[PDB]
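Aim 2 progress. For Engineered scFv, the working sequence is reproduced below.
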Amino acid sequence: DIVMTQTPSSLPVSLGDQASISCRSSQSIVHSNGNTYLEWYLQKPGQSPKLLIYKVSNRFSGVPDRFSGSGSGTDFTLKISRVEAEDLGIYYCFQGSLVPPTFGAGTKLELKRGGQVQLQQSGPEDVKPGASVKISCKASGYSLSTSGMGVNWVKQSPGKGLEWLAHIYWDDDKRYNPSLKSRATLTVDKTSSTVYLELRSLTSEDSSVYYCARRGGSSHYYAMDYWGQGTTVTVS
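Predicted structure tokens for this construct:
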């Protein structure tokens, strides 16, 4: 597997400050093809993560110029020159080059103290242990099947960073994280444009908020450019 060591976890910043988060990976993030699919995500308190940087150094549509990418091969570092209230959140780096793709622990950017594509996610499920859940994720605004689109599922456990669960490609290439012990099955309802993650033998360890995210184009180097607001699964 690939581990993204993110640094620091903490990074307290003052408004207008220079901010710097980095990722080593336990190996090179390169393809073969050629591109190193390192993305950076920002996850403001109440919200799903949102894409910031893809292909290591590429600012995403409508991400302010103050964010920059710049790593190479094995070491990558998001910089924000001028932090603002908007920018406070947990940044996660994300290696999408190897399966399973993995994230960093996250880095909480937090204020130093002192002095239209859209995915909707099925409502939360409270489920007894052993039961299954089928969470849905309705993409709209794009066609679930234009080449290069896929839907990643990513769970975020309270204090287990972001973890990648599965991916469904436009050609219906379903790929899951071995960490799920084959309990996940993706399914798509092309006409309802919904992707269903079904999680099969739930234990409280599976209590997360689960996000579906669109691996965007070949344009966005399959960055998860759009994300469902999440669906919380709670295994009682």
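Residues 18 and 81 are 4 Å apart (CA to CA). This observation will guide construct design in the next reporting period.
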